[PDB]
Design a protein around this ligand. Sequence first.
Ligand SMILES: CCCCCCCCCO[C@@H]1O[C@H](CO)[C@@H](O)[C@H](O)[C@H]1O
Ligand SMILES: CCCCCCCCCO[C@@H]1O[C@H](CO)[C@@H](O)[C@H](O)[C@H]1O
Ligand SMILES: CCCCCCCCCO[C@@H]1O[C@H](CO)[C@@H](O)[C@H](O)[C@H]1O
Ligand SMILES: CCCCCCCCCO[C@@H]1O[C@H](CO)[C@@H](O)[C@H](O)[C@H]1O
Ligand SMILES: [K+]
Ligand SMILES: [K+]
Ligand SMILES: [K+]
Ligand SMILES: [K+]
Ligand SMILES: [K+]
Ligand SMILES: [K+]
Ligand SMILES: [K+]
Lengths: 302, 302, 302, 302
Amino acid sequence: KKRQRFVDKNGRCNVQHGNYLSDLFTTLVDLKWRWFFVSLAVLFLLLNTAFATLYMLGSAPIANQFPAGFGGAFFFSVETLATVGYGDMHPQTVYAHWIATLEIFVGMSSIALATGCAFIKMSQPKKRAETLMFSEHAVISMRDGKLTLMFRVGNLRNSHMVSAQIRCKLLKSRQTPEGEFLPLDQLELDVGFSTGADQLFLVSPLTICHVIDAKSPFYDLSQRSMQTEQFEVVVILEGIVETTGMTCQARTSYTEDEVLWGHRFFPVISLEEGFFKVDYSQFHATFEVPTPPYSVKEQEEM
Amino acid sequence: KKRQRFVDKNGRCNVQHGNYLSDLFTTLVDLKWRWFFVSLAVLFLLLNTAFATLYMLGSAPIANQFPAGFGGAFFFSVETLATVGYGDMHPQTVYAHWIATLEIFVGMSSIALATGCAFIKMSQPKKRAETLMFSEHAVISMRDGKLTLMFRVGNLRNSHMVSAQIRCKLLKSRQTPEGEFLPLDQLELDVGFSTGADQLFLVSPLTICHVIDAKSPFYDLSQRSMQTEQFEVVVILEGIVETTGMTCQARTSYTEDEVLWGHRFFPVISLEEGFFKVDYSQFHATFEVPTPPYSVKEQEEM
Amino acid sequence: KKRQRFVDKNGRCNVQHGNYLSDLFTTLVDLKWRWFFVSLAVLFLLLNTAFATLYMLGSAPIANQFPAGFGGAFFFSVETLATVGYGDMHPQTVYAHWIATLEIFVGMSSIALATGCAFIKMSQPKKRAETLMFSEHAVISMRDGKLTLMFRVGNLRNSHMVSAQIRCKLLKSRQTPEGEFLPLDQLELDVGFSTGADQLFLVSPLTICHVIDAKSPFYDLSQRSMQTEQFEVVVILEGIVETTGMTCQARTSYTEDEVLWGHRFFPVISLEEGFFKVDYSQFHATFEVPTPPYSVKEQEEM
Amino acid sequence: KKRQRFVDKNGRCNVQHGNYLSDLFTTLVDLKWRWFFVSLAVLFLLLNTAFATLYMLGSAPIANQFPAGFGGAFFFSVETLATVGYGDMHPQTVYAHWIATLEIFVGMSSIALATGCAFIKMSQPKKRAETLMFSEHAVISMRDGKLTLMFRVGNLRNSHMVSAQIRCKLLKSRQTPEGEFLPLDQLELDVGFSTGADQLFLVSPLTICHVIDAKSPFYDLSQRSMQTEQFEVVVILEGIVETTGMTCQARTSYTEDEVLWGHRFFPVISLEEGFFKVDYSQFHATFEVPTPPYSVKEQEEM
Ligand SMILES: CCCCCCCCCO[C@@H]1O[C@H](CO)[C@@H](O)[C@H](O)[C@H]1O
Ligand SMILES: CCCCCCCCCO[C@@H]1O[C@H](CO)[C@@H](O)[C@H](O)[C@H]1O
Ligand SMILES: CCCCCCCCCO[C@@H]1O[C@H](CO)[C@@H](O)[C@H](O)[C@H]1O
Ligand SMILES: CCCCCCCCCO[C@@H]1O[C@H](CO)[C@@H](O)[C@H](O)[C@H]1O
Ligand SMILES: [K+]
Ligand SMILES: [K+]
Ligand SMILES: [K+]
Ligand SMILES: [K+]
Ligand SMILES: [K+]
Ligand SMILES: [K+]
Ligand SMILES: [K+]
C-alpha cells in the first residue's frame, strides 16, 4: 500500500533495534485497574499457596489448624501474609515460627511494592486516545501574506495539563553536497520557538502554524514537487498533568500525502450564550482556497 | 450585561466541547480534608456493611460472634477489612474463611488506594484564591519612553514556589487578508521571553510590562479604537511548589473594558525598619497620567 | 549599620505583607528526623490517651483489661490505633466496639497521613547551607576585553542535581523619565540566557559572568558612582535533585558595597594526580588588578 | 598513559573537594532489588533481636512465651514490630506493655520509612549503561558546506523518556588577554539552542552537530593545532522518564585525541519491511573523507 512511515498517526514509532522488572513493570502499570487488581489477587493467591505448602512440610505446625490439612495452612498463611493475625491459628513449632517470620517479611515487602505501583498507576495521565487529538491532515495555504503549513490540535478530556509545548521535526532522507548519506535526517520546523508561540494555551483547538520562508526546510516545496517528495512531519506535544505534576507527551505524523496543498481548515469555535462551543465535527475538515502552485523559492526568485 | 469572555478573572475558561475514576478522582482530591476523610469514612462503613451481610449468608460463620446477628458480623468485618484481627471473633467455617480472605485483599487494596489519594492530596498547591493575585485592571501609559501595557501580580501566602514564569496571549477574532475566519486567534504578547524577564523573582508584587512596538498586536491600538475594539488579554503564571516540587498555574484575563488608557499603578512597596512592607490596599489602584491618545503606529507614521 | 537589603546573603527575603495545616505542614517536614519522629510519638501518645479516656466512659468495655483502670485502656488503645490487635484484650460491649471502630479508622488515617509526610520529608533536598555556596563578594574587572561583573558559585555536598540554571536580577529604586516611582524595580542581568551559558555544568566552582555593555543596567556604573549608588544584585540558582527529581533553589544577594571594583578571583581549581582538586580556602578570595575607573559608557563615549 | 580528563567516558567526574542518611540513602536506593531487600531483612532481624533482649530484661513478660527464653521473645517481637499481633503470646506485665508500645511505634515508623525508600527506588531510571549510548569518538568534517563537529547519541532500552535535551561545553585551561588564569574554563558549544534543534526526538540514533564558525570556540582549530591542543568536550543529555516523570541525565566526554579530523560516521539506520532497523554494529564506526586541514579561521582569512 503506502510507503513505510517512521511514526504512526497515533504516535507509535516503527523502529527496531539490533542485537529489574523494568519491562513487565510498565505492563502492570499500563493495565486497566480491574486487571491490575485481578493481577495482584493472583500473586496473593500464589504466595499464599506457596507458604501454605511450606507450613505443611512440618508436623502440626499450626495451633487449631482449621480446616485440617492444606486448607487451614492456606488461611493461616492469608492472615499472616497480610499481617491480620487473628491468632486463633498461630505458630506452634519453632519451624512454623521461622516460616511465619519469613512470610511476614515477604508480606510487608509485597504490600510495600504493590502500594508503590498503585501510586505510580494513579499518577499516570489518561491515554492520548482520550486526551489529545490532531487533525488527520495538515494543509498549506496563504495566511497573513505568507505560505504556511498548518495542522490542528485540541485537548478533549480536560486532563488539567499546564506547561503545554509543541515541537515539530521534518524527517527526510537526504544526501549532503559533500556526499554524506542521511537516511532519517531531522530538520527543525519552527512553530513558535522564536516568539514563545510554541508555548500553548490549549483549551479550545488550535491551528499550529509553520511559516514557510528561506529558513524553512520547505522553502522549495511546490505543489508539483509535493507529488514526488518523500518526508514525514513529526509532531510532539508535551504538557504536565496539574493534579499529579506528571509530564506527558502526545505525538502524530504527517507524510507527504497527508499534507494538502491549497487547503484551509473550517473553523470549530463558535460563540454561544454563556460560553464558546467547540464543534468537533469540523475538526478534521478542510476546503480548497485559491493558492499559487509555486514554492516560496520559485516566487522569491522569479 | 457585558460581552462573553473566554476566560474569567479567576482563570476559569468558559468553553464547552461537543458530542477510570478520572473525573471523580479530582473531585475527591479537590475536597477539603474534613470532607475527604468524612468521605473515606462513608466508604469504610459501606464496605463493612457489605461484607457483614455476606458473612450473615452463612450459618454460625464467626466464633464468639458479638453481638449476635448483623452487629457482630459488622464489627468482625471492621477488624478484618482494616487488618486489625483481634481474633476473639474469627472465621469458624470454610465459607467464612473465603469471605474473610476476599475482604482482607479488598481491605489492603482500599488502604493502598486511599493512601495514594492522601499523598496526591498532600502534594497539591493551595488554591490560587489564597496564593496568587492579579490586579483587577491593566493600564496603558508611557514608561521609559515607550507606550506600555501593564498589570500587576503578587504572591500572597508564601507557597514556596520557584521557577515562576509568565506568559501572555491576546485572544481576538479576526479575518486574514486571504479571507480566513479566525474566531479565537491567539497572538503572543511579549512580556520578557526575549530578555529572560518573564522568569520572575516574585516575592513582592510586580508590574508586568508589554512594550507596544511594531511587533506588538497592539501596535495600532489607540485610545479611540479601544472604545470599539474587542479582545481579551489572557495571563498565565506558572510556578513550582518547592516543598512538593509540584508545578502549578494561575490565570486571569483582561477584556478591552478592563484596560485603562492613560493610567499608572500606585506603588505598593515601602521601606520600613528591618523590612520592606507591601501595602495591599494600593494593589488594584491606578491614577491618570498625561498620555497621548494616538496609537504607536499613528505616532511612528505621522 | 548598613542599609536594609531586600534579600539576605543566605537567600532570605526581608519582606512583610499587609493585612489546611499549610503553615504547620512545612514546619513538620522542615524538622530534623529525630524531632520529626519525636513529634509523631507525641501525637501517638496523645491520641492513645484520648481514646483510652473514651473507653473508660463505659463499664467493663474491655475483656481481660490489664492493667485494670486507665492503664489497660491505654495499652488496648495502642494495639487498636496501630492495628496490631493482639486481641487478648478486645471490645466486650457494643459501646467499646463503636469506639474501637472509630479508633481503627483514625489509626489508618493517621498512618496514611504520617506516611505521606515521611515521603515528602525524604524527597526534600538538603539545606543550601550544606549544598550550594556563593562567594561573599562579587567583583568588576576586565575579562576578554570587556568590563565584567563576576561572582562565584560551587556545589559542595554532591546533591546529585541536574538541570542547573542561574538567573540574576538587579533590584534598584528608580524614577522613570515620565515620573513613575519604582521602589524595587527589577532589571534583568544577562548571565548566559542568550548563549545557553546560564545552563550550568556545576561540578567544580564556577565564576559567573555578566558582561557590561550598552544593554546592561550597569552600562554607566563607574568606580566613582559605585560609591553613591544603591542597588542589590539578586542571584537565583535552580536545580533538580536527581535521586528524587525535586526542583530546588538557592539564592544570594550583593549590595553595592559587596561588589569590588578592580578585583579578580583567585583560582580554586588545581590539577593533581588522578583528579582535579578544589581548594575551598581561595573560594572567597580576590585581589586587585589594573582596571580603569570609568564606566563603559564614559569609555565608549569619550 | 593519557592526560587526566575531568569527566570519564561514562560520565563520572574526576573531582575532589577540599577540607541525615543523605550519603547512605542513595547507597540503599542504588542497590539492586535483591540486595535492597536482603538489606531490609537484616535491619528487621537486628531490630527484632534488639527488642527481644529488652523483653528478656523483665520477668515472665510474655504470656504463653514459646519457645521459652530468647526465642519466644524474638518471635513475639516479630509479630509486634510488623503489627501482626497473633496475640497467643502477648504482654503480661506493665513493663512488657511499655516495651511493646515502643516497638509498635518503631515498627510503624520503620515500615513507613522502608515504604518511602521503595517508592523512590521504583521511580529511579535504569542506569545509563543500559539506556543512553554515545559514540566513542567525535569527528570533524564538512557537512552542508560547513566544517562541523559531530558525535552520535542513541537510546537503547526504551526508557520512555520525553523532554530530551542536549547541551555541550568545552572545558579548557586558558589565560585571558588581561592575564587571568582560568584552569577549567567552560565555553558553550552551540548544538541547537538557537534553532530548537537541541530538543531531540531520540528514538533512533542521532548525529549531534556543532557548526564551527566565528562564534565557535573551535573557530581556529586546525588539523595541525589539534595535535597540540588540550581540551575536553563534555556532553550532557537530559530527559524525563515518562512512566515516573523523573528527570534523568547521561554524560560523556571527548578529549582532543578522541576527536577525529576528516572523518564521517557510517549510517546506522536502514529501511526494512514494516519498520526501520538500527544496525548498532556501525554505531561507533567512522571513515576518512576529503577534508581540508585548515581551521575555519585560516580559511575565512586566507
Ligand atoms: C478510597 C478509594 C480511592 C480509590 C481512588 C482510585 C483512583 C484511581 C485513579 O486512576 C487514575 O486516574 C487518572 C485521572 O485522574 C488517570 O489519568 C489514570 O490513568 C488512572 O489510572
Ligand atoms: C501525623 C499527621 C500528619 C498530618 C499531615 C497533614 C498534612 C496536610 C497537608 O495538606 C496540604 O497542605 C498544603 C500546604 O502545605 C496545601 O497546599 C494543600 O492544599 C493541602 O491539602
Ligand atoms: C529501613 C529504614 C530506611 C530509612 C531511610 C531514611 C531516609 C532518610 C532520608 O532523609 C533525607 O535524605 C536526603 C538526602 O538523601 C536529604 O536531602 C533530606 O533532607 C533528608 O530528609
Ligand atoms: C506486587 C509486586 C509488585 C512489584 C513491583 C516491582 C517494581 C520494581 C521496579 O524497579 C524499577 O524499574 C524501573 C523500570 O521500570 C527501573 O528503571 C528502576 O531502576 C527499577 O528499580
Ligand atoms: K492481630
Ligand atoms: K489476635
Ligand atoms: K500499612
Ligand atoms: K517534575
Ligand atoms: K513526584
Ligand atoms: K496490621
Ligand atoms: K494486625
